[PDB]
Amino acid sequence: VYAWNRKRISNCVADYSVLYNSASFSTFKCYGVSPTKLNDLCFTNVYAD
Amino acid sequence: YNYRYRKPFERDISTEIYQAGSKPCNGVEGFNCYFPLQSYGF
């Protein structure tokens, strides 16, 4: 938790709507938009850790 | 606590807990089940 780094996705499709019910987000929260409403979008680096 | 926030010249005085996503909240509070009105921290 004090030694992680800014990994990311690139050159791919995505399907973010599943995070609104899947066990991978059994507890979850956001600063950004709703998971399925924003799920069609993209940005130049899919930063995730 | 006296001062709070959530069509033109509407005034929606209701305070139902948001069914804010994938859940039938209907009085329940939690993830995707959010109370709509908040105080400004004045």
Curated annotation (Swiss-Prot), chain B:
Q: Where is this region: Immunodominant HLA epitope recognized by the CD8+?
A: 1-6
Annotated stretches, region: Disordered: 7-35
Consequence of changing residue 29 to K:
In strain: Beta/B.1.351, Eta/B.1.525, Theta/P.3, Iota/B.1.526, B.1.1.318, Gamma/P.1, Zeta/P.2 and Mu/B.1.621; May enhance affinity to human ACE2 receptor
Impact of mutating residue 31 to P?
In strain: Omicron/XBB.1.5, Omicron/EG.5.1
Q: What is the effect of changing residue 31 to V?
A: In strain: Omicron/BA.4, Omicron/BA.5, Omicron/BQ.1.1
Disulfide pairs here are 25-33
Q: Domain of life, per the record?
A: Viruses
The protein's assembly and partners: Binds to host ACE2. RBD also interacts with the N-linked glycan on 'Asn-90' of ACE2. Cleavage of S generates a polybasic C-terminal sequence on S1 that binds to host Neuropilin-1 (NRP1) and Neuropilin-2 (NRP2) receptors. Interacts with host integrin alpha-5/beta-1 (ITGA5:ITGB1) and with ACE2 in complex with integrin alpha-5/beta-1 (ITGA5:ITGB1). May interact via cytoplasmic c-terminus with M protein. May interact (via N-terminus) with host bilirubin and biliverdin, thereby preventing antibody binding to the SARS-CoV-2 spike NTD via an allosteric mechanism.
Function statement: Attaches the virion to the cell membrane by interacting with host receptor, initiating the infection. The major receptor is host ACE2. When S2/S2' has been cleaved, binding to the receptor triggers direct fusion at the cell membrane. When S2/S2' has not been cleaved, binding to the receptor results in internalization of the virus by endocytosis using host TFRC and GRM2 and leading to fusion of the virion membrane with the host endosomal membrane. Alternatively, may use NRP1/NRP2 and integrin as entry receptors.
Q: What is this protein called?
A: Spike protein S1
Native organism:
Severe acute respiratory syndrome coronavirus 2 (2019-nCoV)
